[PDB]
Design a binder for this molecule. Structure first.
Ligand SMILES: Cc1[nH]n(-c2nc3c(Cl)c(Cl)ccc3[nH]2)c(=O)c1[C@@H]1OC(=O)c2ccccc21
Ligand SMILES: [Zn+2]
Length: 357
DNA sequence: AAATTGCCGAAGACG
DNA sequence: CGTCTTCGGCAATT
């Protein structure tokens, strides 16, 4: 039953080939345009991230995430109030003349200024693309992405995300996050935390507006690693090991949410990241591969559901990397919204998920 | 050195 | 199930 649903969600290789060919062409051309001189972004390097590259994209290969990461040496972070996730960015000394100087607000590196120039460069390069139907989506306030819309003729969206790369130790708000010590282990956790961390230009929302200069942490690289390396046993899902159902559970939950969001606009505040965060917590709670045997799929999905419902009820979903940051706080999502989603999930749960059709 | 190449894991396709 | 395939990621190579 869930097996038949998984069959429907599975991407098709011909669809993948057609989409990847086009997306790869467009991204490679923008990355190159960025390498151009003058460009304040000259040293940017590409990191593919998100559902498609984690192999948990469902239904159709029509959404691609790509981080353009820029190593910016020696920056100081100032936590924006007590959020743990959002920061003001300053440069330590003064780099004689360096080209991020235009994006400065005196001493602070404005996320909005830098993203605006990045978007402008992308829009200009896109207008010069003639062999492919592609346009830039209208700017979305408080979004770090420049979103491309490709018609292949199928509709494909590509989010291009500027990221600042910093090689220093991770901000202390993350010190008790990534609780993978009983699952993936201490050597993995330590090695993951020696990797760079990233800032993307998503502005903090304080009230009815955004704080234009704030940046937000991103662990898209770390999450991608975990999805590809998700077993307590090193051979989990390898050719000489045993298949588990962890990723299939994630797909089913993404599907349930997406089907619900598509017909109820009361759910606009939710997104796949909430589901991804929930299952990260589930994998920490139930680390044994034996707990995610494919024969147990139904019970794993149900336990994920029970857990997600408890998060909604209690208005608490801790960010997996930043435990202080509650994704389900009143400030971010209204009570009413969480109770609406609770009633809809419970109904689908007790009626055999009719919405899976 | 910016672009090419090689290798192989993940997973879709098929019987 | 096994086998065969393509795509993505990496980094040595030129
Ligand atoms: C609600 C939400 N939070 N969230 C998210 N918040 C993140 C935080 Cl705070 C850190 Cl530190 C790292 C990654 C994070 N991802 C998201 O990525 C989203 C969704 O991504 C969006 O841009 C978005 C937009 C509308 C609804 C949901 C989301
Ligand atoms: Zn596995």
């Amino acid at each position: 039953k869930l097996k038949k649903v998984l069959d429907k969600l599975r991407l098709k290789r011909k669809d993948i080939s057609e989409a990847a060919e086009t997306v790869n062409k467009v991204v490679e051309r923008l990355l190159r345009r960025m390498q151009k001189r003058e460009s304040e972004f000259k040293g940017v390097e590409q990191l593919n991230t998100g559902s498609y590259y984690e192999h948990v994209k469902i239904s159709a290969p029509n959404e691609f995430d790509v981080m353009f990461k820029l190593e910016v040496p020696r920056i100081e972070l100032q936590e924006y109030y007590e959020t743990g996730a959002f920061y003001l960015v300053k440069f330590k000394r003064i780099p004689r003349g360096n080209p991020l100087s235009h994006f400065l607000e005196g001493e602070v590196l404005s996320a909005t200024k830098m993203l605006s120039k990045f978007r402008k460069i992308i829009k200009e390069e896109v207008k010069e693309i003639k062999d492919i139907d592609v346009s830039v989506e209208k700017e979305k306030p408080g979004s770090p992405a420049v979103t491309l819309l490709i018609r292949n003729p199928e509709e494909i969206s590509v989010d291009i995300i500027l990221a600042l790369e910093s090689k220093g130790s991770w901000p202390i708000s993350t010190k008790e996050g990534l609780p993978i010590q009983g699952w993936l282990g201490t050597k993995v956790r330590t090695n993951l935390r020696r990797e760079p961390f990233y800032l993307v230009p998503k502005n903090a929302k304080d009230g009815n507006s955004f704080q234009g200069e704030t940046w937000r942490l991103s662990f898209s690289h770390t999450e991608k690693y975990i999805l590809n390396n998700h077993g307590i046993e090193k051979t989990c899902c390898e050719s000489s090991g045993a298949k588990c159902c962890r990723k299939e559970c994630l797909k089913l939950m993404k599907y349930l949410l997406e089907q619900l969001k598509k017909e109820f606009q009361e759910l606009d505040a939710f997104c796949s990241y909430h589901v991804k965060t929930a299952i990260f917590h589930m994998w920490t709670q139930d680390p044994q591969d034996s707990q995610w045997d494919p024969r147990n799929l139904s019970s794993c999905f149900d336990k994920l559901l029970a857990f997600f419902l408890e998060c909604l009820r209690t208005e608490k979903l801790d960010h997996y990397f930043i435990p202080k940051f509650n994704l389900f706080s009143q400030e971010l999502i209204d009570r009413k919204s969480k109770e609406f989603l609770s009633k809809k999930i419970e109904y689908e749960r007790n009626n055999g998920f009719p919405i899976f059709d």
